[PDB]
Amino acid sequence: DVRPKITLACEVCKHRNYITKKNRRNDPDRLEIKKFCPNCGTHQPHKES
Amino acid sequence: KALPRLKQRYREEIREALQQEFNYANVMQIPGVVKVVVNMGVGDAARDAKLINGAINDLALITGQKPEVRRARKSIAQFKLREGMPIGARVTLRGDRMWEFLDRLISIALPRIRDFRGLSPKQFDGTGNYTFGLNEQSMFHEIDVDSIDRPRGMDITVVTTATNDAEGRALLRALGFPFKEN
Amino acid sequence: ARLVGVDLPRDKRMEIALTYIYGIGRTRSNEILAATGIDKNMRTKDLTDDQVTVLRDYIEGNLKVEGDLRREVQADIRRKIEIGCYQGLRHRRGLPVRGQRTKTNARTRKGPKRTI
Amino acid sequence: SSSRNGRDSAAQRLGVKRFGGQVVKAGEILVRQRGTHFHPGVNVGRGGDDTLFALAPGAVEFGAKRGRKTVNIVPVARP
RNA sequence: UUGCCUCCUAAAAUGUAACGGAGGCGCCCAAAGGUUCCCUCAACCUGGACGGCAAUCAGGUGUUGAGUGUAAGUGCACAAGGGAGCUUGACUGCGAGACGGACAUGUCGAGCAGGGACGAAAGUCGGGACUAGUGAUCCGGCACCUCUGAGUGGAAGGGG
Ligand SMILES: [Mg+2]
Ligand SMILES: [Mg+2]
Ligand SMILES: [Mg+2]
Ligand SMILES: [Mg+2]
Ligand SMILES: [Mg+2]
Ligand SMILES: [Mg+2]
Ligand SMILES: [Mg+2]
Ligand SMILES: [Mg+2]
Ligand SMILES: [Mg+2]
Ligand SMILES: [Mg+2]
Ligand SMILES: [Mg+2]
Ligand SMILES: [Mg+2]
Ligand SMILES: [Mg+2]
Ligand SMILES: [Mg+2]
Ligand SMILES: [Mg+2]
Ligand SMILES: [Mg+2]
Ligand SMILES: [Mg+2]
Ligand SMILES: [Mg+2]
Ligand SMILES: [Zn+2]
């Protein structure tokens, strides 16, 4: 598909909140960015599911 | 507490001679060397960029400062070259390093050239700038003989403050390159 | 060992180790070893640096080796091919210069064989 | 024989919307445009899609400033 | 031929048909986003080993003729073009006032709080210079919840 949809989930609470798109061929590895998690209340790293 | 011999010569006698023999209005109309540029384009980088490493090594050995790597600003299909690849390396000499390189050149490299018949006085471009090329690099004594694998030439250019061609020709003759007589 | 950018063989008699140098061959090696008095049968395991260095000194003082040799060879080739000499034209055509029997032999100069 | 044309888009209703001498409220839209045919001035901001909107109440006044077409808002005196 | 985007016909507000005249779209980018800092091309002329009408270097002329991922138009030399350091605001809770329309759709937005990025500071940041890259209702799946639970306590099921 070239452009699969992916879901980002927090680490401690483990809740799926954000959804984006990425190119697997260009980025075989998983994504690792920092986003705002409402329930946690602080910016924490989010790892692609 | 040190000063290069060529710089001493220029600031002691060359400037006075030029001023006397051209009759300038003020003190600082006498031309002076600004910078020296050394570069070379290989053209084979499109197939093998390994030779670029040897080119950089040779340039560092001859000069003593890390040179550049230059890309291409256009893509030519007939020359089978596209954007982004490296093509050649350059380096600029100023001040004490420039004087030392010029002195070493005139003292060693030029006399050591095989079949050296002089330099054409027609190499100027009108405004007082000299440029010429070389075919073989091992003439320089700083690069050892057996460590080189392939022959690579280079082009070196000198720029002065001379207003016209005659001023620069006189200044560089006073410096004393082996000019040809015509 | 190593000399003038030439990797001396791990274990070879000096009479051929010096031969491996492009500027020195069999009889030149024989004469050089006779002059230096060095035995021509010993192995590389007993080689020592000082004798090698003095040998390098003698050979560089008395002869021209490797890149210089190449350079005058191609200088000769280019001058002969530019002056229009018979050897120059033969080099242009990639054929023997002495004028041997090109009829069947000279495959060494003509390179591989291609059929028509 | 036939034709391969005959397809078109919709109409975006572009163009100036509030003319000089009028009175506008805060956050009003003054001009809709593709490029920066006009430019923001005083008390006027440039939107995401190159649209112009007012920041404070007043009266519109078209004007130019050093090779530009600009829109300005004057602070009409309070009665 | 059947939907969406750009131009002309379209008679200098908006709008305006035809089997009229021309073209694209059913993508792409983890940087081609955010912020801070710096620079300006194409072309022509003159000199240089291969090197030539064009490869890399030096000097001179050069105010938009180069360039803007993708078709057109509107713009951009103050840059929205080119080069570099850091980083994910390609957020959460909200929204005064408007833009046009038969209806359902679409679009812009100053400003407050939480917790961030950039910069010494003033300040910008709710994806991409702008306009296309998409699909209502019903039915069902997945994660979570201080909702409900057919006598009571659970569970099944139903709910946001
Ligand atoms: Mg990458
Ligand atoms: Mg000059
Ligand atoms: Mg239209
Ligand atoms: Mg934007
Ligand atoms: Mg946008
Ligand atoms: Mg109109
Ligand atoms: Mg009608
Ligand atoms: Mg079509
Ligand atoms: Mg960037
Ligand atoms: Mg220039
Ligand atoms: Mg830029
Ligand atoms: Mg409303
Ligand atoms: Mg805040
Ligand atoms: Mg805001
Ligand atoms: Mg941008
Ligand atoms: Mg139905
Ligand atoms: Mg019950
Ligand atoms: Mg349940
Ligand atoms: Zn969380």
Short mmCIF file of N, CA and C in Angstrom, two decimals, chain B residues 27-125:
data_model
loop_
_atom_site.label_atom_id
_atom_site.label_comp_id
_atom_site.label_asym_id
_atom_site.label_seq_id
_atom_site.Cartn_x
_atom_site.Cartn_y
_atom_site.Cartn_z
N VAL B 27 49.90 56.54 -1.82
CA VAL B 27 50.82 55.51 -1.36
C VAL B 27 50.27 54.12 -1.66
N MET B 28 48.97 53.91 -1.47
CA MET B 28 48.40 52.57 -1.51
C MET B 28 47.67 52.27 -2.82
N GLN B 29 48.12 52.85 -3.93
CA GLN B 29 47.68 52.38 -5.24
C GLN B 29 48.49 51.19 -5.74
N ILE B 30 49.63 50.89 -5.11
CA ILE B 30 50.46 49.79 -5.61
C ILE B 30 49.70 48.48 -5.44
N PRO B 31 49.61 47.65 -6.48
CA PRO B 31 48.86 46.39 -6.34
C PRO B 31 49.55 45.42 -5.40
N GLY B 32 48.74 44.52 -4.85
CA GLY B 32 49.25 43.47 -3.98
C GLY B 32 48.43 42.21 -4.15
N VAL B 33 49.07 41.08 -3.86
CA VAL B 33 48.42 39.79 -3.99
C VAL B 33 47.33 39.67 -2.94
N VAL B 34 46.20 39.07 -3.32
CA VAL B 34 45.05 38.94 -2.44
C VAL B 34 44.91 37.50 -1.98
N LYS B 35 44.74 36.58 -2.92
CA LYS B 35 44.56 35.18 -2.58
C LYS B 35 45.00 34.32 -3.75
N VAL B 36 45.22 33.04 -3.46
CA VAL B 36 45.61 32.05 -4.46
C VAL B 36 44.63 30.88 -4.37
N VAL B 37 44.12 30.45 -5.52
CA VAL B 37 43.11 29.40 -5.59
C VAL B 37 43.71 28.20 -6.31
N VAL B 38 43.50 27.01 -5.75
CA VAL B 38 43.96 25.76 -6.33
C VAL B 38 42.77 24.81 -6.39
N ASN B 39 42.56 24.20 -7.55
CA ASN B 39 41.44 23.28 -7.72
C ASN B 39 41.73 22.35 -8.89
N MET B 40 40.83 21.39 -9.08
CA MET B 40 40.91 20.45 -10.19
C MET B 40 39.61 19.67 -10.27
N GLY B 41 39.11 19.48 -11.49
CA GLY B 41 37.91 18.70 -11.73
C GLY B 41 38.28 17.38 -12.38
N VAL B 42 37.75 16.30 -11.81
CA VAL B 42 38.10 14.96 -12.27
C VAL B 42 37.15 14.48 -13.37
N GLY B 43 35.84 14.62 -13.14
CA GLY B 43 34.85 14.15 -14.09
C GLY B 43 34.53 12.68 -14.00
N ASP B 44 35.35 11.89 -13.31
CA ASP B 44 35.10 10.47 -13.12
C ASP B 44 34.38 10.17 -11.81
N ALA B 45 34.06 11.19 -11.02
CA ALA B 45 33.34 10.98 -9.77
C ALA B 45 31.97 10.36 -9.99
N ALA B 46 31.37 10.59 -11.16
CA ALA B 46 30.08 9.99 -11.45
C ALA B 46 30.13 8.47 -11.41
N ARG B 47 31.28 7.86 -11.70
CA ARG B 47 31.43 6.41 -11.59
C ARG B 47 32.14 6.00 -10.30
N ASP B 48 33.24 6.67 -9.96
CA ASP B 48 33.99 6.32 -8.76
C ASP B 48 34.34 7.57 -7.97
N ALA B 49 33.81 7.65 -6.75
CA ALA B 49 34.11 8.73 -5.83
C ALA B 49 35.31 8.42 -4.95
N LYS B 50 35.89 7.22 -5.08
CA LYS B 50 37.06 6.88 -4.27
C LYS B 50 38.24 7.78 -4.59
N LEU B 51 38.45 8.10 -5.87
CA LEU B 51 39.54 8.99 -6.24
C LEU B 51 39.42 10.35 -5.58
N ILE B 52 38.21 10.74 -5.18
CA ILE B 52 38.04 12.01 -4.48
C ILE B 52 38.79 11.97 -3.16
N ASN B 53 38.80 10.82 -2.49
CA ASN B 53 39.54 10.69 -1.24
C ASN B 53 41.03 10.96 -1.46
N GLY B 54 41.60 10.35 -2.50
CA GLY B 54 43.00 10.60 -2.80
C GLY B 54 43.25 12.05 -3.18
N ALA B 55 42.31 12.66 -3.89
CA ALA B 55 42.45 14.07 -4.23
C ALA B 55 42.49 14.94 -2.98
N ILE B 56 41.59 14.68 -2.03
CA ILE B 56 41.58 15.45 -0.79
C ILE B 56 42.87 15.22 -0.02
N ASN B 57 43.35 13.97 0.01
CA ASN B 57 44.60 13.69 0.72
C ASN B 57 45.76 14.46 0.10
N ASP B 58 45.86 14.45 -1.23
CA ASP B 58 46.93 15.18 -1.90
C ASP B 58 46.83 16.67 -1.62
N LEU B 59 45.62 17.22 -1.67
CA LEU B 59 45.44 18.65 -1.42
C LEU B 59 45.84 19.01 0.00
N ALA B 60 45.45 18.18 0.97
CA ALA B 60 45.83 18.44 2.35
C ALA B 60 47.34 18.39 2.52
N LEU B 61 47.99 17.40 1.90
CA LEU B 61 49.44 17.30 2.02
C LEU B 61 50.13 18.51 1.40
N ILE B 62 49.69 18.94 0.22
CA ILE B 62 50.37 20.05 -0.45
C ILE B 62 50.11 21.36 0.29
N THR B 63 48.87 21.61 0.71
CA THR B 63 48.51 22.88 1.32
C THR B 63 48.68 22.85 2.84
N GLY B 64 48.03 21.88 3.50
CA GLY B 64 48.02 21.81 4.94
C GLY B 64 46.69 22.19 5.58
N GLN B 65 45.66 22.45 4.78
CA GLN B 65 44.33 22.77 5.29
C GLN B 65 43.30 21.91 4.58
N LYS B 66 42.24 21.57 5.29
CA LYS B 66 41.24 20.67 4.74
C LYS B 66 40.52 21.34 3.57
N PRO B 67 40.52 20.76 2.38
CA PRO B 67 39.86 21.39 1.24
C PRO B 67 38.35 21.14 1.23
N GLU B 68 37.72 21.59 0.15
CA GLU B 68 36.29 21.49 -0.04
C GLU B 68 35.94 20.24 -0.83
N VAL B 69 34.64 19.94 -0.88
CA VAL B 69 34.08 19.05 -1.89
C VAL B 69 32.89 19.76 -2.52
N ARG B 70 32.92 19.91 -3.84
CA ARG B 70 31.95 20.71 -4.57
C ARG B 70 31.01 19.82 -5.37
N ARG B 71 29.74 20.17 -5.37
CA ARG B 71 28.73 19.45 -6.12
C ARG B 71 28.58 20.09 -7.50
N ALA B 72 27.54 19.70 -8.23
CA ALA B 72 27.22 20.27 -9.53
C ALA B 72 25.85 20.94 -9.45
N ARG B 73 25.74 22.13 -10.01
CA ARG B 73 24.50 22.90 -9.96
C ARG B 73 23.58 22.63 -11.14
N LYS B 74 23.95 21.72 -12.03
CA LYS B 74 23.10 21.39 -13.17
C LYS B 74 23.28 19.92 -13.52
N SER B 75 22.29 19.37 -14.22
CA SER B 75 22.31 17.98 -14.66
C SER B 75 22.36 17.95 -16.18
N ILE B 76 23.35 17.24 -16.72
CA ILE B 76 23.56 17.13 -18.16
C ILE B 76 23.43 15.66 -18.53
N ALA B 77 22.44 15.34 -19.37
CA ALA B 77 22.22 13.96 -19.76
C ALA B 77 23.34 13.44 -20.66
N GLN B 78 23.80 14.27 -21.60
CA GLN B 78 24.87 13.83 -22.49
C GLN B 78 26.16 13.56 -21.72
N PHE B 79 26.47 14.38 -20.73
CA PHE B 79 27.56 14.11 -19.81
C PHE B 79 27.18 13.10 -18.73
N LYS B 80 26.00 12.48 -18.83
CA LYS B 80 25.61 11.39 -17.93
C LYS B 80 25.89 11.74 -16.47
N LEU B 81 25.59 13.00 -16.12
CA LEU B 81 25.76 13.50 -14.76
C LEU B 81 24.47 14.16 -14.29
N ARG B 82 24.14 13.94 -13.03
CA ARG B 82 22.93 14.47 -12.41
C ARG B 82 23.29 15.31 -11.20
N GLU B 83 22.27 15.79 -10.50
CA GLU B 83 22.46 16.67 -9.36
C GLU B 83 23.03 15.90 -8.16
N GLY B 84 23.84 16.59 -7.37
CA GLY B 84 24.21 16.15 -6.04
C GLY B 84 25.55 15.46 -5.93
N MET B 85 26.10 14.96 -7.03
CA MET B 85 27.37 14.25 -6.90
C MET B 85 28.53 15.24 -6.78
N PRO B 86 29.64 14.82 -6.18
CA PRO B 86 30.81 15.69 -6.12
C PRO B 86 31.60 15.63 -7.42
N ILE B 87 32.22 16.76 -7.76
CA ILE B 87 32.93 16.91 -9.02
C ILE B 87 34.39 17.26 -8.81
N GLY B 88 34.69 18.18 -7.90
CA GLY B 88 36.06 18.60 -7.69
C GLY B 88 36.24 19.23 -6.33
N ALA B 89 37.49 19.57 -6.03
CA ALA B 89 37.86 20.17 -4.76
C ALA B 89 38.65 21.45 -5.00
N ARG B 90 38.51 22.40 -4.08
CA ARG B 90 39.19 23.68 -4.16
C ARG B 90 39.81 24.01 -2.81
N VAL B 91 40.66 25.05 -2.81
CA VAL B 91 41.30 25.52 -1.60
C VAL B 91 41.78 26.94 -1.85
N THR B 92 41.76 27.76 -0.79
CA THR B 92 42.18 29.15 -0.86
C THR B 92 43.32 29.39 0.12
N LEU B 93 44.34 30.10 -0.35
CA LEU B 93 45.51 30.43 0.45
C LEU B 93 45.57 31.93 0.65
N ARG B 94 45.75 32.35 1.90
CA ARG B 94 45.84 33.76 2.24
C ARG B 94 46.93 33.97 3.28
N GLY B 95 47.50 35.17 3.28
CA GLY B 95 48.41 35.56 4.35
C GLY B 95 49.68 34.74 4.37
N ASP B 96 50.08 34.34 5.58
CA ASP B 96 51.36 33.66 5.75
C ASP B 96 51.41 32.35 4.97
N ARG B 97 50.33 31.58 5.01
CA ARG B 97 50.30 30.33 4.25
C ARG B 97 50.43 30.60 2.76
N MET B 98 49.76 31.65 2.27
CA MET B 98 49.87 32.00 0.86
C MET B 98 51.31 32.34 0.50
N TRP B 99 51.96 33.16 1.32
CA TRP B 99 53.34 33.54 1.03
C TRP B 99 54.26 32.32 1.04
N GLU B 100 54.09 31.44 2.04
CA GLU B 100 54.93 30.26 2.13
C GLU B 100 54.72 29.35 0.92
N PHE B 101 53.47 29.14 0.53
CA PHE B 101 53.19 28.29 -0.63
C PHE B 101 53.79 28.89 -1.89
N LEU B 102 53.65 30.20 -2.08
CA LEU B 102 54.21 30.84 -3.27
C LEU B 102 55.72 30.70 -3.31
N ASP B 103 56.38 30.93 -2.17
CA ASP B 103 57.83 30.82 -2.11
C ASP B 103 58.28 29.39 -2.41
N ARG B 104 57.62 28.41 -1.78
CA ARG B 104 57.98 27.02 -2.03
C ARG B 104 57.78 26.66 -3.50
N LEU B 105 56.66 27.10 -4.08
CA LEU B 105 56.41 26.86 -5.49
C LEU B 105 57.56 27.38 -6.33
N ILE B 106 57.80 28.70 -6.28
CA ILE B 106 58.81 29.32 -7.13
C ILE B 106 60.18 28.70 -6.89
N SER B 107 60.48 28.31 -5.66
CA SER B 107 61.81 27.81 -5.33
C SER B 107 62.04 26.38 -5.80
N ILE B 108 61.04 25.51 -5.71
CA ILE B 108 61.22 24.08 -5.94
C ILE B 108 60.45 23.60 -7.17
N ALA B 109 59.14 23.85 -7.20
CA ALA B 109 58.29 23.15 -8.16
C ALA B 109 58.62 23.55 -9.59
N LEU B 110 58.67 24.86 -9.87
CA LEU B 110 58.89 25.31 -11.24
C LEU B 110 60.22 24.82 -11.81
N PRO B 111 61.36 24.99 -11.13
CA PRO B 111 62.61 24.46 -11.70
C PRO B 111 62.60 22.96 -11.89
N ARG B 112 61.82 22.23 -11.10
CA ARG B 112 61.78 20.78 -11.18
C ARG B 112 60.89 20.27 -12.31
N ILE B 113 60.14 21.15 -12.98
CA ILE B 113 59.26 20.72 -14.06
C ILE B 113 60.10 20.14 -15.19
N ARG B 114 59.63 19.02 -15.75
CA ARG B 114 60.31 18.40 -16.88
C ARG B 114 59.95 19.15 -18.15
N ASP B 115 60.97 19.54 -18.92
CA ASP B 115 60.78 20.31 -20.15
C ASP B 115 60.04 21.61 -19.85
N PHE B 116 60.67 22.45 -19.04
CA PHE B 116 60.09 23.71 -18.60
C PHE B 116 60.64 24.82 -19.49
N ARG B 117 59.78 25.37 -20.35
CA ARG B 117 60.19 26.38 -21.31
C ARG B 117 59.70 27.78 -20.96
N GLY B 118 59.11 27.96 -19.78
CA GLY B 118 58.62 29.26 -19.35
C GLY B 118 57.10 29.32 -19.36
N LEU B 119 56.60 30.50 -19.00
CA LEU B 119 55.17 30.76 -18.92
C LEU B 119 54.78 31.83 -19.93
N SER B 120 53.70 31.57 -20.66
CA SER B 120 53.25 32.50 -21.68
C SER B 120 52.81 33.81 -21.03
N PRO B 121 53.30 34.96 -21.50
CA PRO B 121 52.80 36.24 -20.97
C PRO B 121 51.38 36.57 -21.38
N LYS B 122 50.74 35.74 -22.20
CA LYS B 122 49.39 36.00 -22.69
C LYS B 122 48.32 35.35 -21.83
N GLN B 123 48.69 34.76 -20.70
CA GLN B 123 47.73 34.09 -19.83
C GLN B 123 46.86 35.06 -19.05
N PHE B 124 47.15 36.35 -19.09
CA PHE B 124 46.33 37.32 -18.38
C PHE B 124 44.93 37.38 -19.00
N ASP B 125 44.00 37.98 -18.25
CA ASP B 125 42.63 38.16 -18.70
C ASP B 125 42.24 39.63 -18.79
#
